[PDB]
């Protein structure tokens, strides 16, 4: 079954998505803090964390393993893969979510002709030393995430700490995790969202080259956009005050 | 198990050498083919081995085999 766990006091309920490779205990940095503005419904994606029933899955069947026990009506944030996840359900089940946010996330991950991405084999030779050496890269992943920001060190640490809370995801579900990556691409479908949208980045993420942020502010002309300068791929671990701020702010456009 | 030892094995496991072979004078970068991924793993776990925290500054001036050594000692 899809692990959840619901806490706070807000009258706005909010769901929140990991990552890759992570599971829901890489939110308790800022936990606390949105609880008190937000009801809260925490999971771990379908084969991560305490998600175990479950092995390889497209995006869509994801999705909707993740909307069964999903609250009736919440704003849903998506982080990196997480992001598609919530994208996937804004897309198909719209009345379901009162808005989309997407963090450190792309609609494209994989490179294309004038799109930024992560090229495909640079992501061919990770899935591989996946298969090889799997720690040394889950843990170059993690140092990956944060390189370059003033807390790189500290903040590798707080994400180490998530993946030990846990036993690791078996091989078969964090390679499905890279082939959704691979292949989704869902920059055509998303400027049809009509609910809110809005999509924080960060500046020095490497795994989303910030110059999609200007092409999407474009594609997506209904969609809102927010760079955090100092951030990598995780600005909720780096920039926790600032991050739960602009989810506030947009809590009160919601109403 | 002494220091040297200690943080030679750091290395060898980091950057993926045998630590036997492991020389005192070896250049992450140059000799050891570090990229700075390995570098702040390499940092990383000297810090968890020795208990220790060392400012971005120290880290920085770490480039050998050596310079690890010499710092985690006076320390
Ligand atoms: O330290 P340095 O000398 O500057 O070296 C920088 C390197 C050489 C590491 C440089 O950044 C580099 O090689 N970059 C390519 C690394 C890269 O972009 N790899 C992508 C691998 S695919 C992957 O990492 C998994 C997909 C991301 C997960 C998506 C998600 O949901 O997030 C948790």
Known sequence: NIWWQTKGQGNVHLVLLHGWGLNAEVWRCIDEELSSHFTL????????????????????????????????????????????????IALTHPER??????????????????????????????????????????????????????????????????????????????????????????????????????????????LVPRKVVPMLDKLWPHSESYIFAKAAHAPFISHPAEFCHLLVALKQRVL | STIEERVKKIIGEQLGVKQEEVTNNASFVEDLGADSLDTVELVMALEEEFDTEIPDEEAEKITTVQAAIDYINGH
């Open chain 1, 97 to 206: 979510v009162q808005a989309l946010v997407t963090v450190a996330s792309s609609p494209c991950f994989s490179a294309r002709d004038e799109w930024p991405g992560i090229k495909p084999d640079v992501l061919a030779g990770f899935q591989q030393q996946l298969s090889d050496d799997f720690q040394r890269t889950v843990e170059r992943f993690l140092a990956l995430q944060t390189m370059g920001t003033e807390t790189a060190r500290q903040d590798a640490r707080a994400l180490k700490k998530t993946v030990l809370a846990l036993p690791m995801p078996e091989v078969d579900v964090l390679n499905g995790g890279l082939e959704i990556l691979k292949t989704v691409d869902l920059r055509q479908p998303l400027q049809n969202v009509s609910m809110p949208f809005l999509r924080l980045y960060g500046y020095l993420d490497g």
């Open chain 1, 41 to 88: 419904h925490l999971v771990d994606l379908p084969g991560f964390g305490r998600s175990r029933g479950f092995g390889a899955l497209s995006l869509a069947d994801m999705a909707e393993a993740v909307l069964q026990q999903a609250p009736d009506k919440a704003i849903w944030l998506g982080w990196a893969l997480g992001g598609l996840v919530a994208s996937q």
